[PDB]
């Protein structure tokens, strides 16, 4: 299990969330705008949907 | 009002990737501007 | 804030890459480009950012 809202980066509930809040690392390169590794990158590419 | 804001809370339970209240808000503003404007 | 093997991410040229798997007919460009960027839009964003600072 992994929390979808937490996987985006923020969950309003937190400790009260029904799903698990796996701590992840974000890709700075994706955070500035572009990462060529895409799915192969070690670091998370959070979707802002 | 916001439960990440209390000393008995741990932000990491709310924000992933080491975000802060301010860094997350900043991240949302960037999202807003970039996807529309400029 | 970005960098690739010692080069600011905005100053990297996408045309130099050997793979360019973000041209594929159906690839997940969201995996590569954030904020809904495109290869052209990212380079434009890059060229805009450089002219400023
Ligand atoms: Zn959650
Ligand atoms: Zn990445």
Author numbering:
A (entry chain A): 122 to 170
B (entry chain B): 147 to 184
C (entry chain C): 129 to 181
Please give sentences taken from the publication describing this entry.
In mammals, the cleavage and polyadenylation specificity factor (CPSF) constitutes the core of the 3′ end processing machinery onto which the remaining factors, including cleavage stimulation factor (CstF) and poly(A) polymerase (PAP), assemble. These interactions are mediated by Fip1, a CPSF subunit characterized by high degree of intrinsic disorder. Here, we report two crystal structures revealing the interactions of human Fip1 (hFip1) with CPSF30 and CstF77. Taken together, these results provide a structural basis for the multivalent scaffolding and regulatory functions of hFip1 in 3′ end processing.
